[PDB]
Design a binder for this molecule. Structure first.
Ligand SMILES: *[C@@H]1O[C@H](CO[C@@H]2O[C@@H](C)[C@@H](O)[C@@H](O)[C@@H]2O)[C@@H](O[C@@H]2O[C@H](CO)[C@@H](O)[C@H](O)[C@H]2NC(C)=O)[C@H](O)[C@H]1NC(C)=O
Ligand SMILES: *[C@@H]1O[C@H](CO)[C@@H](O[C@@H]2O[C@H](CO)[C@@H](O)[C@H](O)[C@H]2NC(C)=O)[C@H](O)[C@H]1NC(C)=O
Ligand SMILES: *[C@@H]1O[C@H](CO)[C@@H](O[C@@H]2O[C@H](CO)[C@@H](O)[C@H](O)[C@H]2NC(C)=O)[C@H](O)[C@H]1NC(C)=O
Ligand SMILES: CC(=O)N[C@@H]1[C@@H](O)[C@H](O)[C@@H](CO)O[C@H]1O
Ligand SMILES: CC(=O)N[C@@H]1[C@@H](O)[C@H](O)[C@@H](CO)O[C@H]1O
Ligand SMILES: CC(=O)N[C@@H]1[C@@H](O)[C@H](O)[C@@H](CO)O[C@H]1O
Ligand SMILES: *[C@@H]1O[C@H](CO)[C@@H](O)[C@H](O)[C@H]1NC(C)=O
Ligand SMILES: *[C@@H]1O[C@H](CO)[C@@H](O)[C@H](O)[C@H]1NC(C)=O
Lengths: 49, 40, 50, 50, 150, 99
């Protein structure tokens, strides 16, 4: 593993999910049985570290 | 050819094509035209 | 001018034309977005998954 | 003319095996029906306007 | 040895509208501020339900068919219902499972049970203590067991 | 083959269904239009659950009416004329109004 690199365009591989983006802190409130969030068009929108 | 019923025996063919009727019937249209000629 | 002002204050339907323009454009974009979830016979709709 | 069409009889007709394949394309003919119904309503408006 | 309650009345099944109850989370994935359309097994609104009741001599323990899935709801003042039993033949011929809210520890098992015809927990009025658990005479070919925390 | 009779073939009835409603806030009343069908076939197919889609709860009351575009279920005919609110077809018009 590595440390996080917030606020910069980076490759990310959180847990078998791959892409590129800008990581930032969030104000989501996940339930203890939810690990991912999705938008319309089935794009991943947020993740639990 | 296509399904339609004019009268009202309605028949339908396997191609699934259909023709809808107009709202204003021909005697209502002819009453508008006779009202225009009358008033004018 | 007073009566037209009260009418505009209470009516909703009078601007249906402009409203239809906005709704037509928005609906069109919504459809183009929704088409991404289709499968077209692929094993999955998710590109990065494949 | 103000004609109308039914998607499933024309493309797939009686069979169910074909309908389970046409399902993979989603909403397409339904927006088609939405369009052809708009043309039908327009014809009535044209005659009432004239 | 099983104890059979004599003089028990036959039940009087009662009908009630279920209204809108029974919705549950379809999937784990998070979503927000959106309307989602999905197909799954659900309890249709305003469907009718078969009510049951234990009062005085009356005592109803009737085998109910499962129809590949059931809703369930109970109204209890002092833990009257302790759980369920799922099986197909319940006569030394098919695997059965027991779920019970045993006061000391929740127990889930999936083994041949040969469950007693009238399984029950025995209690004493003034002490408020449990004395017997006449649920199953024996158990063989047992392949599954679980115990929750104390 | 057995008797050398000559027999025609023709399809089982099909068409579109569409729903007429006043505003949801005003009321929850609906009327259903079955397009280009004689009511005898749809009534004889609603009964004994031969139609599809199959509602869980509905009923064809005594209110059945026949039009050239098809027949309406759940609307009451009236022997009076007014200005159109919702056009149906062939001269038939609908509205939501006092009994
Ligand atoms: C409730 O169950 C507990 C625990 O389940 C027991 O062990 C299971 C493997 C199975 O054999 C069940 O049928 C048993 O009832 C019972 O407490 C156990 O008691 C025994 C001695 O009889 C002891 O050796 C175990 O350690 C206990 N298990 C614990 C403490 O978790 C208990 O008697 C049952 N009834 C009541 C009223 O509590
Ligand atoms: C598993 O389910 C099947 C079917 O649901 C059960 O088979 C039925 O058994 C009864 C026993 O009398 C027959 O009368 C039925 O005809 C069978 N088929 C159906 C569709 O009901 C089978 O019993 C179940 N498994 C066990 C172990 O009981
Ligand atoms: C489950 O199996 C046991 C053992 O096969 C059954 O116990 C038998 O019961 C009969 C009459 O009830 C006795 O004649 C046998 O001697 C018993 N067998 C043994 C080994 O003691 C038991 O009855 C079965 N369960 C049910 C519900 O019938
Ligand atoms: C019920 C029956 O056998 N035939 C009827 C016919 O009488 C009626 O005129 C027609 C309406 O279009 O619908 C059909
Ligand atoms: C002493 C006595 O009769 N107790 C109850 C009675 O109050 C009740 O009405 C009846 C059935 O409800 O069951 C019994
Ligand atoms: C647009 C709208 O809300 N229209 C009416 C509202 O004026 C009225 O107060 C309400 C009463 O239930 O019925 C609705
Ligand atoms: C609801 O009542 C219907 C009859 O209208 C019956 O067929 C059905 O079994 C009932 N549902 C139950 C008992 O769950
Ligand atoms: C357990 O099952 C085996 C076969 O699966 C059987 O031979 C044996 O008799 C069973 N144990 C008993 C009945 O105690």
């Amino acid at each position: 593993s590595t440390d996080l690199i917030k606020n910069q365009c980076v490759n990310f591989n959180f847990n078998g999910l791959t892409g590129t983006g800008v990581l930032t802190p969030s104000s989501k409130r996940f339930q203890p049985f939810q690990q991912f969030g999705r938008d319309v068009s089935d794009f991943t929108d947020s993740v639990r570290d | 050819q296509y399904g339609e019923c004019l009268g009202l025996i309605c028949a339908q063919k396997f191609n699934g094509l259909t023709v809808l009727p107009p709202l204003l019937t021909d005697d209502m249209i002819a009453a508008y035209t006779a009202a225009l000629v009358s008033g004018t | 001018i007073s009566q037209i002002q009260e009418s505009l204050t209470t009516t909703s339907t009078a601007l249906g034309k402009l409203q239809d323009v906005v709704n037509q454009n928005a609906q069109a974009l919504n459809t183009l977005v929704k088409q991404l979830s289709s499968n077209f016979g692929a094993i999955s709709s998710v590109l990065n998954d494949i | 003319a103000k004609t109308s069409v039914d998607c499933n009889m024309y493309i797939c007709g009686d069979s169910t095996e074909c309908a389970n394949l046409l399902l993979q394309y989603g909403s397409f003919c339904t927006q088609l029906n939405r369009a052809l119904s708009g043309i039908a309503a327009e014809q009535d408006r044209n005659t009432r306007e004239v | 040895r099983c104890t059979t309650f004599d003089d028990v009345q036959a039940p009087n099944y009662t009908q009630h509208t279920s209204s809108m109850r029974g919705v549950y989370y379809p999937d784990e994935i998070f979503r927000s501020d959106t309307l989602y359309l999905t197909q799954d097994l659900f309890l249709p609104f305003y469907s009718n339900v078969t009510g049951f009741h234990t009062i005085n001599h009356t005592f109803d323990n009737p085998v109910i068919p499962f129809k590949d899935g059931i809703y369930f709801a109970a109204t209890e003042k002092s833990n009257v219902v302790r759980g369920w039993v799922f099986g197909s033949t319940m006569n030394n011929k098919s695997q059965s499972v027991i779920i019970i809210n045993n006061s000391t520890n929740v127990v889930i098992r999936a083994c041949n049970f040969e469950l007693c015809d009238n399984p029950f927990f025995a209690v004493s009025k003034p002490m408020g203590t449990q004395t017997h658990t006449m649920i199953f005479d024996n158990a063989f070919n047992c392949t599954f067991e679980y115990i929750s925390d104390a | 083959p057995k008797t050398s009779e000559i027999l025609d073939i023709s399809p089982c009835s099909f068409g579109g269904v569409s729903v007429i409603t006043p505003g949801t806030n005003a009321s929850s009343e609906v009327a259903v239009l079955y397009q280009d069908v004689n009511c005898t076939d749809v009534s004889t197919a609603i009964h004994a659950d031969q139609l599809t889609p199959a509602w869980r709860i509905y009923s064809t009351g005594n209110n059945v009416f026949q039009t050239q575009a098809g027949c309406l279920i759940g609307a009451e005919h009236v022997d009076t004329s007014y200005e159109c609110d919702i056009p149906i077809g062939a001269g038939i018009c609908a509205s939501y109004h006092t009994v």
